[PDB]
Design a protein around this ligand. Structure first.
Ligand SMILES: *[C]([O])C1=NC2=N(C(=O)[C]1)C([C])=[C]S2
Ligand SMILES: [Cl-]
Ligand code: NA
Lengths: 301, 304
């Protein structure tokens, strides 16, 4: 028993991490089958941060301009193309460690594991969640671009994130594996502020249900609430609006504990009103919002 | 920027996890070279665990009673022996995915990564710190016995932990890879309770340095202190005493940020007495003590 923010075993992703170099810039690439996926701003020079013309920059590139390094072995680039904001380098060798995989674009509130990488070699793994403002609160240093986020269901790795840049507030922005950025961000060094971050309400509720399953009920009350009255209160604490979809998603956890969704919602209204009063829930002094209902039902059986 | 509870890449350990079954009890085993390591209580039934005689149970067993499964391939046991509380099952084939590895024992307050597994299948990885009471606050449901804890220095995997049991307070107890338990525990079904835990002071200090590196500086102040004065405050709040070696270890962080340890202990002393006052540190409303100074340097420098 225990509730820890657990990341997925990174073995299937480590076997796909390579190093991509263009000019003086080195970042990470994802080697799947005979294609290497990496951020397109690897082809940017110092004068190209603010207003890069990626098409103009890419048409001036040949295959041998891209140096792909898998461990100590150099891969031969035989083709290259641009799909939105990711570069796709066709290489002469299929990755024999290519796992069962697919590309999935995720929604805010969804969680995933990140394999932090530098120079194509893995540094560490940690669990993340897509914030409502389409950023992630990860741990990235210079040279971590190309690090990927993923979920592993059975033995299939669902790649959902690729790191591209850090915003001035310390949060991080990236794309899916088709090159489409999460949120309104662009691979430009101009002023782009992330929206005010809010709490993933559906994740807090599932995390409160997990506390009830684990024998913690000190925060429950005998009040209920309407969906609108809860959203009127939750917005005042910068909580994400709770939708009817979120209510149906919490259905199984509600039936397991015997506590209605709007009953748990009134309990959350009181927790925001009172705080924790020196107490903890599942070991935390704050309300955790990076466990999805899917994580809770799976991890708590 | 950013600071996260970061675990080591678990790929080198994933290629060593196998399933070990003795009768109806199945758990995880660590397959290194031609030997599979697993907890010795795999040979116990519900009545055996009440008061087991392991050498009696082992001398009854033979190689065929041990079912080792590596993925989908069965491994043929050709020998069995005991070393303290781990069972060493010699198999006919050496693991081709054996990494460069060492068996090490870690100190309380040091951190390591745990590859949680269920029936030889790795399901999750996370970062622990060995508590001063020699337990770990992990997430181990049934079927996780045999999961290993490890550190990676360069290419060498230092195995330090093997999960054996869960305690009634939700914490977990285990041994090193040589069978030596961590803490005053035994591998049998009896009334066992973890002692009163304390907070690892040197880890809290390293975590405050991580916040300063990350632009969180509101808790700094103009004051400094001495090691004896702070240790008086640490004992009052159930904090591990800060030794002089602990101060030397924090040396590089004190030089990177410019805040002396005793300077930072003055900040920690004020946080213990007056709280945080509605504010957070690295997005936390409590003092985190599961980051060693080496963990902070490694994450804030990009060592791979
Ligand atoms: C690219 O690779 C990059 N990424 C990142 N960064 C840099 O600089 C670069 C930071 C700072 C964070 S993340
Ligand atoms: Cl999603
Ligand atoms: Na100070």
């Amino acid at each position: 028993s225990g509730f820890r923010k657990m990341a997925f075993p990174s073995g299937k992703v480590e076997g796909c991490m390579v190093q991509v170099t263009c000019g003086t810039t080195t970042l990470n690439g994802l080697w799947l089958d005979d294609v290497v996926y990496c951020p397109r701003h690897v082809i940017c020079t110092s004068e190209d941060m603010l207003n890069p013309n990626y098409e103009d920059l890419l048409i001036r590139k040949s295959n041998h301009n891209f140096l792909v390094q898998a461990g100590n072995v150099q891969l031969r680039v035989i083709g290259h193309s641009m799909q939105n904001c990711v570069l796709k380098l066709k290489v002469d060798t299929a990755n024999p460690k290519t796992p069962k995989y697919k590309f999935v674009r995720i929604q805010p509130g969804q969680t995933f594991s990140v394999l932090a990488c530098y120079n194509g070699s893995p540094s560490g793994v940690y669990q993340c969640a897509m914030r409502p403002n389409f950023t992630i609160k990860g741990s990235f240093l210079n040279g971590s671009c190309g690090s990927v986020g993923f979920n592993i269901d059975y033995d299939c790795v669902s790649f959902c994130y690729m790191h591209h840049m850090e915003l001035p507030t310390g949060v991080h922005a990236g794309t899916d594996l088709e090159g489409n950025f999460y949120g309104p961000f662009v691979d430009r060094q101009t002023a782009q502020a992330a929206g005010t971050d809010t709490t993933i309400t559906v994740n807090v509720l599932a995390w409160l249900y997990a506390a009830v399953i684990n024998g913690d009920r000190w925060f429950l009350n005998r009040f209920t609430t309407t969906l609108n009255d809860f959203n009127l209160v939750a917005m005042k604490y910068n909580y994400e609006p709770l939708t009817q979809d979120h209510v149906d998603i919490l259905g199984p956890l509600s039936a397991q504990t015997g506590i209605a969704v709007l009953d748990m919602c009134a309990s959350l209204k009181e927790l925001l009103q009172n705080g924790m009063n020196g107490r903890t829930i599942l070991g935390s002094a704050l309300l955790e919002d990076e466990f999805t209902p899917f994580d809770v039902v799976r991890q708590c059986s």
